[PDB]
Design a binder for this molecule. Structure first.
Ligand SMILES: [Mg+2]
Length: 172
């Protein structure tokens, strides 16, 4: 199924694909990346400007994310302003960073609202590499999830790689 707003698959889909892609990427001794994406200032937008505005921003974000992928990559909508992105196959971690950087830069452009006004926001992106960080869907997902949290907390609108001491940084 694909959500009616943005036409994007849901987590259930995303996990299976990631599973299949992980089994695959293991076999050919190759790399893949998971990106966890959360919009910045979302609640503020809906409060100050209302559902319709929010939805518009979601649709835009969705369009801009897919704008930066290759036919082989996958965007799912987790829920809310939050999306999951599968980057397979991958030449290098560098590549993942670079794509993230482009998704981030994509947001420098303002978003046209239904009344012709304009909002600017950011995304925050946590990135988790295979096989450097984890080797199971659940784990990889979790790691990206956490990296994103840490990123929102450290500086909004940025991308951050999962580190191995991430649970210690979460604890402190
Ligand atoms: Mg948000």
């Amino acid at each position: 199924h694909h959500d009616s707003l943005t036409s994007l698959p849901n987590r259930a889909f995303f996990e299976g694909r990631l599973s299949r892609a992980l089994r695959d990427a293991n076999e050919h001794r190759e790399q893949l990346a998971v990106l966890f994406i959360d919009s910045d200032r979302f609640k503020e937008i809906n409060d100050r400007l209302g559902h319709a505005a929010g939805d518009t921003v979601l649709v835009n974000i969705a369009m801009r994310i897919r704008g930066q992928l290759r036919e082989s990559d996958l965007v799912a909508r987790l829920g809310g302003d939050e999306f999951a992105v599968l980057l397979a196959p991958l030449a290098s971690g560098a590549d993942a960073l670079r794509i993230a950087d482009n998704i981030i830069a994509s947001m420098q452009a303002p978003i046209r609202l239904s009344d012709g006004s304009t909002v600017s926001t950011s995304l925050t992106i946590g990135i988790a590499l295979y096989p450097e960080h984890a080797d199971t869907p659940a784990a990889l997902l979790h790691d990206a999830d956490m990296a994103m949290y840490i990123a929102k907390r450290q500086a909004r609108g940025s991308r951050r790689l999962a580190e191995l001491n991430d649970p210690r940084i979460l604890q402190e």
